[PDB]
Amino acid sequence: SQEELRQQIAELVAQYAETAMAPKPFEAGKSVVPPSGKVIGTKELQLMVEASLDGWLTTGRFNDAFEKKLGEYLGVPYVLTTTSGSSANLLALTALTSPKLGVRALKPGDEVITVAAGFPTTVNPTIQNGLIPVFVDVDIPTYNVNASLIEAAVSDKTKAIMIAHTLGNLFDLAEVRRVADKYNLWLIEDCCDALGSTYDGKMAGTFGDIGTVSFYPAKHITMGEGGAVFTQSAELKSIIESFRDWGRDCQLGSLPFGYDHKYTYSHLGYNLKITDMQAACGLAQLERIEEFVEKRKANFKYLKDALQSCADFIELPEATENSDPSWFGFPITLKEDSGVSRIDLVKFLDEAKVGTRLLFAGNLTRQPYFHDVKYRVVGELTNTDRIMNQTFWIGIYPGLTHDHLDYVVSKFEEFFGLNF
Amino acid sequence: SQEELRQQIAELVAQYAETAMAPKPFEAGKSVVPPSGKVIGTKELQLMVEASLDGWLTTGRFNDAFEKKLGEYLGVPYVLTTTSGSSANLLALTALTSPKLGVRALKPGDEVITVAAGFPTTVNPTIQNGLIPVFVDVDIPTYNVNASLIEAAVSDKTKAIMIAHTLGNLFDLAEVRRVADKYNLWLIEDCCDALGSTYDGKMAGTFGDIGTVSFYPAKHITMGEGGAVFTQSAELKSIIESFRDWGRDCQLGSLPFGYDHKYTYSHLGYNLKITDMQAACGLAQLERIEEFVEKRKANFKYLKDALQSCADFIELPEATENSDPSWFGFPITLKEDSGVSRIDLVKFLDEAKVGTRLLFAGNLTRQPYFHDVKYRVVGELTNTDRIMNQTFWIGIYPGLTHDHLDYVVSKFEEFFGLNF
Ligand SMILES: *Cc1c(COP(=O)(O)O)cnc(C)c1O
Numbered sequence: 005s006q007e008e009l010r011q012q013i014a015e016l017v018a019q020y021a022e023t024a025m026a027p028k029p030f031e032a033g034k035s036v037v038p039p040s041g042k043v044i045g046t047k048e049l050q051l052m053v054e055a056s057l058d059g060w061l062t063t064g065r066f067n068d069a070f071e072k073k074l075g076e077y078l079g080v081p082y083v084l085t086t087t088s089g090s091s092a093n094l095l096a097l098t099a100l101t102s103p104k105l106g107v108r109a110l111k112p113g114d115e116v117i118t119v120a121a122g123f124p125t126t127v128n129p130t131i132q133n134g135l136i137p138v139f140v141d142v143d144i145p146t147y148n149v150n151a152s153l154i155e156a157a158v159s160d161k162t163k164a165i166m167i168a169h170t171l172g173n174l175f176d177l178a179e180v181r182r183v184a185d186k187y188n189l190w191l192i193e194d195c196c197d198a199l200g201s202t203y204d205g206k207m208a209g210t211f212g213d214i215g216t217v218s219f220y221p222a223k224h225i226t227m228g229e230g231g232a233v234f235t236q237s238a239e240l241k242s243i244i245e246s247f248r249d250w251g252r253d254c255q256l257g258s259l260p261f262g263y264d265h266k267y268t269y270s271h272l273g274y275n276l277k278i279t280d281m282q283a284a285c286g287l288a289q290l291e292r293i294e295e296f297v298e299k300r301k302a303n304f305k306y307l308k309d310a311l312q313s314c315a316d317f318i319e320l321p322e323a324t325e326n327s328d329p330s331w332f333g334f335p336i337t338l339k340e341d342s343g344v345s346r347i348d349l350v351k352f353l354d355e356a357k358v359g360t361r362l363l364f365a366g367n368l369t370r371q372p373y374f375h376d377v378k379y380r381v382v383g384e385l386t387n388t389d390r391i392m393n394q395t396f397w398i399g400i401y402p403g404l405t406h407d408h409l410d411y412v413v414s415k416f417e418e419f420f421g422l423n424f
Numbered sequence: 425s426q427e428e429l430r431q432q433i434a435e436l437v438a439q440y441a442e443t444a445m446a447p448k449p450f451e452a453g454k455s456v457v458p459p460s461g462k463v464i465g466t467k468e469l470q471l472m473v474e475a476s477l478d479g480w481l482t483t484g485r486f487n488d489a490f491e492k493k494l495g496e497y498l499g500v501p502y503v504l505t506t507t508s509g510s511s512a513n514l515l516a517l518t519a520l521t522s523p524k525l526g527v528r529a530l531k532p533g534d535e536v537i538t539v540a541a542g543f544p545t546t547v548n549p550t551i552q553n554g555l556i557p558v559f560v561d562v563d564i565p566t567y568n569v570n571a572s573l574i575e576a577a578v579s580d581k582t583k584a585i586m587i588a589h590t591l592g593n594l595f596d597l598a599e600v601r602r603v604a605d606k607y608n609l610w611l612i613e614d615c616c617d618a619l620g621s622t623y624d625g626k627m628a629g630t631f632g633d634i635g636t637v638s639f640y641p642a643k644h645i646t647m648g649e650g651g652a653v654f655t656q657s658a659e660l661k662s663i664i665e666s667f668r669d670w671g672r673d674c675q676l677g678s679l680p681f682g683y684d685h686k687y688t689y690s691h692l693g694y695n696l697k698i699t700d701m702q703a704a705c706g707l708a709q710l711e712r713i714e715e716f717v718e719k720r721k722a723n724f725k726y727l728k729d730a731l732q733s734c735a736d737f738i739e740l741p742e743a744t745e746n747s748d749p750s751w752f753g754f755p756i757t758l759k760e761d762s763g764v765s766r767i768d769l770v771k772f773l774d775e776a777k778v779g780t781r782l783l784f785a786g787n788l789t790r791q792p793y794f795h796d797v798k799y800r801v802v803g804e805l806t807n808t809d810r811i812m813n814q815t816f817w818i819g820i821y822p823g824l825t826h827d828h829l830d831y832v833v834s835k836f837e838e839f840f841g842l843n844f
Pocket residue numbers: 088089090091093122123125126168194196197218219220230231695
């Protein structure tokens with residue numbers, strides 16, 4: 005009678021969701037236009053109940069299904085789930101320190117090339133593994149690494165490049181891969197805000213050795229808290245897994261014969277696994293990713309077209325050459341000769357119920373926790389500093405309707421006095 | 425039909441749990457006697473459904489309730505949830521590296537005193553922060569540090585002591601604290617397998633600066649995957665939370681005035697948070713903790729009394745002086761001169777459906793991943809090696825009835841020919 009009880013519960017929740025998770029009609033001056041948010045329906049809540057009923061708890065039925073369907077969407081054979089994007093970035097960079105990679109293994113002291121205009125945990129794992137971060141400037145209005153500056157940052161200590169596809173926009177993969185392959189550097193693609201982004205027709209994350217993604221509520225799809233590491237190399241997939249799972253194996257050491265393999269450890273590991281409840285949510289969301297990716301590209305096009313009327317005061321976002329960005333948010337840099345400060349605009353928008361966000365750390369090297377970190381900067385961080393000082397982004401996620409954006413646009417116009 | 429679509433779901437769930445989480449009648453030869461396992465029911469599945477329906481996903485309503493009730497049970501003000509017991513250990517040790525702790529902040533090169541007879545993630549955080557682990561031997565048959573050896577392992581570089589109350593049994597807190605307070609060393613109590621354990625009447629994990637616990641299915645209570653860091657210090661609580669939450673602040677750097685606090689980072693952080701779904705499961709479990717602790721003590725006394733008949737071949741476990749250990753498992757050391765191997769015994773019990781587990785890493789210094797790690801060992805690890813070779817544990821968790829245990833006892837007797 006269980007199979008029944010399930011399907012009956014599946015109904016009771018489906019009708020609970022249609023009432024709860026229902027889109028509220030937009031209302032200027034009352035409704036908010038957040039920079040991001042999750043979009044969950046019946047399928048999400050249903051599967052989470054299914055997982056709750058299973059009583060299994062740790063990863064299993066749903067986690068297998070999720071890692072599989074996500075591997076399909078991405079076009080990669082190996083996908084490992086983890087606690088968050090940050091955790092995924094950590095596993096990705098840590099995995100390359102495995103002595104199983106012989107001479108290719110990252111060692112304390114080695115250098116990782118990246119940029120300072122990003123999210124802290126894109127860089128932290130490098131520091132947390134005793135490596136030295138080496139920064140170069142980014143470009144505006146793509147808000148991604150200025151590829152041309154990469155080559156000069158390469159020294160004999162350089163072992164890898166780890167940068168994110170900022171806000172869904174892709175970086176110059178053509179130039180990055182060129183510099184990577186030339187010097188035999190590892191490459192890690194932080195796609196935490198770029199699920200669905202393509203470059204030269206190929207899905208983001210599948211160009212380098214390892215790719216990461218996040219399932220925090222603000223990203224493309226969510227599990228509440230969750231993330232994933234994916235690769236095409238079986239060797240890396242096994243190393244990542246070991247690090248995630250207490251560092252356990254699957255010879256060295258002097259353990260007695262017959263010692264349980266389960267309790268044999270080959271790596272300096274962590275326990276960064278998730279539950280099947282989180283997996284379920286993720287699984288339902290995967291049924292909406294294609295839609296989500298399309299609505300983001302649309303909202304971006306619409307919004308930008310409309311906002312072109314303020315081009316004298318703000319610089320609008322531009323997708324990177326030869327790429328089709330699955331926009332995470334809408335970045336805007338306010339001109340210095342506009343007569344007002346970012347604070348003014350943000351505060352104005354805030355009062356208008358229009359949410360905004362700065363570009364994460366702005367300039368990592370100027371963040372307080374970077375006070376005593378050992379790092380190198382090649383060239384100047386002019387654009388990064390400009391980002392920290394003048395840049396901010398707004399919302400184009402699936403939860404925003406054309407009426408939402410129209411409102412945001414009129415506010416920008418009202419602000420700059422363009423409605424007169 | 426909202427509150428009420430919700431009270432009706434709770435029904436179809438409370439009735440699905442009757443058939444699903446119903447204890448199966450013991451059957452010798454067919455039924456198994458695992459060394460550990462989760463004991464969940466109606467309440468657990470119900471709350472997880474509530475959280476699922478909430479549609480919040482990230483920590484919230486339930487996580488607040490859980491951290492609160494655990495703080496009450498433990499007798500501490502600050503409790504922070506995290507992804508696992510291993511993550512809890514990671515956050516506890518890392519937090520002490522915060523420059524906010526001035527002169528007494530762990531720095532790479534510093535030493536942390538611990539034992540080699542334990543679990544990998546109890547020690548890894550030390551290594552992962554660039555510190556140096558310093559080991560001293562343990563004692564049988566308590567299986568906890570030989571406290572009298574701590575003193576000699578202390579040096580000018582010693583800044584802390586991080587040890588776990590192995591298998592629920594408590595290490596010699598009196599001597600440890602004495603040594604800690606003397607040299608002003610930080611003390612971290614890994615209580616991942618000791619929830620409910622008391623020493624001198626005082627709850628385990630509240631004698632030192634930071635405490636950690638795990639919620640993996642094998643532990644006292646579960647969330648599938650999850651754990652918690654707890655302390656009595658508001659300062660440590662703030663440092664921990666920052667590290668758990670992207671290292672975001674709770675002045676230095678050169679950020680522009682008005683930069684979003686949400687994006688101001690004071691620590692080299694991670695993202696080790698869980699979902700409210702997990703929080704829910706844990707909350708339900710908290711009701712049954714007192715029952716569980718009482719039951720584990722019962723099964724221990726019973727099993728050990730019954731197994732006293734084999735005292736000639738195996739050494740039975742002994743609670744540490746002046747402690748009321750909330751047993752995690754039942755540790756047994758097979759005598760060398762018994763004429764057989766642990767391999768034989770395990771293999772025999774395995775066939776009999778009696779699950780066994782070695783004492784985790786046995787001897788960490790002999791594990792393959794420790795091949796190149798920098799560490800120090802004061803004195804010899806004689807008992808540790810003995811544990812690696814001759815020790816193992818079996819099941820006394822709440823999911824085991826007297827019929828389960830009696831069956832196990834008959835198998836031990838049958839093995840050593842005591843039934844004759
Ligand atoms: C969100 C994010 C992360 C990490 O993801 P979490 O799930 O928040 O831990 C890493 N890098 C970038 C660029 C991100 O936006």
